[PDB]
UniProtKB/TrEMBL annotation, chain B:
<protein>
    <submittedName>
        <fullName>Uncharacterized protein</fullName>
    </submittedName>
</protein>
TrEMBL record, chain C:
<protein>
    <submittedName>
        <fullName>Uncharacterized protein</fullName>
    </submittedName>
</protein>
Amino acid sequence: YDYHFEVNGTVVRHKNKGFGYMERFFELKEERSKLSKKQYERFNALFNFFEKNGVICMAKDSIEINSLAYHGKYDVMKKFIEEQSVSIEDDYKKAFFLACLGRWEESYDLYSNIILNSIDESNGCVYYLSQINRYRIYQSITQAVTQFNGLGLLTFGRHYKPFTDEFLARIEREMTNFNIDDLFNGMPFEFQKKYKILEFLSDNQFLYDDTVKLFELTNKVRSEMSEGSYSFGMSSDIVVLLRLYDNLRFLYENCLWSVSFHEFHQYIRNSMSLLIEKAEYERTRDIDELGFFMEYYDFVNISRHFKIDDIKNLERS
Amino acid sequence: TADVYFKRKSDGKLVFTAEAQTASFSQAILRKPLYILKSEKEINLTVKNAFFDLEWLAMTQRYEVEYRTIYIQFPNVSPSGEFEMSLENGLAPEIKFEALADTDTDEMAVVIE
Amino acid sequence: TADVYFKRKSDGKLVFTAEAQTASFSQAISEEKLRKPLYILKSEKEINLTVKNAFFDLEWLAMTQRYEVEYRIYIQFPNVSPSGEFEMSLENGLAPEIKFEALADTDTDEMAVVIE
Amino acid sequence: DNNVVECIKEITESSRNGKLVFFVGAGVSTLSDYPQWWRLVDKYHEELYGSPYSSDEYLRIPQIFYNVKGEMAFDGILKDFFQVDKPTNPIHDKILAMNPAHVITTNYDNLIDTACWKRGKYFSVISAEEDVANATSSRYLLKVAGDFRKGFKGENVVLKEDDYLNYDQNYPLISNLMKTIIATHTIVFIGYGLGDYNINMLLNWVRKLQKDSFHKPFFIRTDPSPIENETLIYYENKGLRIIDAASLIDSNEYDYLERYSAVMDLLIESQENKFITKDDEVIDYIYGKISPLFALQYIRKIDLKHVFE
Ligand SMILES: NC(=O)c1ccc[n+]([C@@H]2O[C@H](COP(=O)([O-])OP(=O)(O)OC[C@H]3O[C@@H](n4cnc5c(N)ncnc54)[C@H](O)[C@@H]3O)[C@@H](O)[C@H]2O)c1
């Protein structure tokens, strides 16, 4: 909490009382030769990390999501799965792809084997994310089995049983009394010290913060629309769009299966359809005395996270 | 706060029974001759606390709806199968179905008093 | 991303500076019944303004121990009343947002002046 | 019966609070088809006297071999038996499903460590003296009989007579940690024989403790035949609460996974509401859950789900 990083990509000193490392760092990025060789290489790495993650400059002064799952490259994903995975990192997104193409049994087995092989992990981040994804896949398997035993009878008529009873019993045995909330606490303290930003992924309701922030932004935007006021700086609508894209890119590029659950779907559906409503209000806004267009990514988000009835409501409004 | 009975069309067996939760009847209007009063009517119904009958379940291991409050009868109800998973485990199953209309009958829903 | 300069009305002293964030002019007609004669053109012109990051002048802070606004086209509100509505949040609080409403003296009868 | 029901209730109550520690014996490792000690003792006996027990013999034969054939021969014979890997059995999954505070095991294998890695709970494993001082995690997997992590030599493990003789001197920190964990946490013994060296040593140490100053450890017996009543009284008066797997379920002697599975399924499935059938116990349970809430003027209706787990 020494500084505050905002969606636009500008840092503001919020709690740092001592010397400001980011204030000097940004100018240092903008005479660097006086730094040591190791220090220069480390600064190069830091600059690459910061510019790739969108932390550009300080307060005083679009998105591209790289993933086959987001773009629905269902055949490139199959080809990637077929290829022998050289490294565990390449086998993590491979398990994510296996999950994305159904194949939840294969995805669960692959995640379990990744966890098994992640003993010698340099950092253990892959192990933590694999635990999260395996819990998510077990949840998906359980809910799908319940649906197939229920609605899966009215719908499809027949009984499907995609997962063998032996696999279901084994996964229930392994996942018995598995509190996901504790997963981050039951980690080496080095991981907890270093990977504090991944703590939010542990809790079974990790979109509550994002949902609450989107609720606040939606209320602000609707108040602006009702009053008829004019926003000057970075409008709350732009903040909503920026946070939506940040969440989408973080969840898809890191190959997290929680991106396929109803909570995230509803979060994206509300983040959109609030940009759209605000844009429509902006279009039909009377002039006084004193635009938004949908890209490819917006089309993909609306197609994926919107039910047909939700699109119908958006059209009606 | 009435009750909904889902029954097999041919045999007449009650597939299940639950509690009606929502109903949307939205019928509205490229598509000199005689007026035919063409309309595109849709009826959707979301059901609550649906438990499938043990007999029909064991048998499974066209449909009708009878929603009784005053007295409503939906013939040819197609059950939509949209399945979503919540990361929060799960809480009761919610069933949604759309009223279907046969060409010959041309009737989608019936109201009985 | 335009800046609002706060001045003490009496002199040229700078009360503080901020960045204009939201400006609402919901100026329309008032109740008809409650208010043959020559037309007067009654109105209920209101102008609210919000500033995101306002830092109060150090000299003004030291001295403190009518206001004018210049929003930079250039707009000027000769008289503005800052609404001091303070609400606290559980999330430890950090953007100090200042809301002020333009006032209109009876003689001048003008609230804001926007000039190129 | 009431005795076993109370035993299960205590075990589950301790487990839910995070105060449960599991003392895993060699039976859990044998369930994974790991080479039992008697096989290696037979190998040592064959090597010593040409052609092929008891607590004394188990310690003596390896001890005799150590100084008769040399350290290298001992290490090689033990590595050729223990170097093989095995898959963790369902009993390890059941053990870890209880979320035990600590796992103390005399096994020199890594099956329990592998299961802990599987479950996702990081158990800092302590199998050497240096491990105790530097163990970042608060969850200890205490290998009180050494381990082969450092190497496959016989020094790293406690399986010969002199090793057991100087255990207190050789493993002061490890012994102190195990005793502190036993005194503080609830202990359940699984995969151990009633007439076992480690269990008898623990009972001898417990005898030194002041009366009723400690909690009596639980011992899950998975022997093929039902335990004799006399032995049951003898061991329950020595500071043990015995849960007999053979008594609960009748199964053929040759197979053992069924008894372990039965005991662990009783442990996991058991819930405080599982046993309340009397309508005088229903009110007792509800009042036990709701009484502390009487100190609050109003309790949110939706929040009550937390009260009733
Ligand atoms: N007694 C010997 O020294 C010796 C020599 C050769 C073979 N064996 C065999 O081993 C058994 C004795 O085992 P021990 O030295 O561990 O003493 P043990 O039988 O006392 O050890 C018992 C713990 O190990 C468990 N156990 C025994 N057999 C098991 C199996 N197949 N799978 C899982 N757990 C098992 C029991 O769980 C028990 O609680 C004998 O009954 C015999 O079948 C013993």
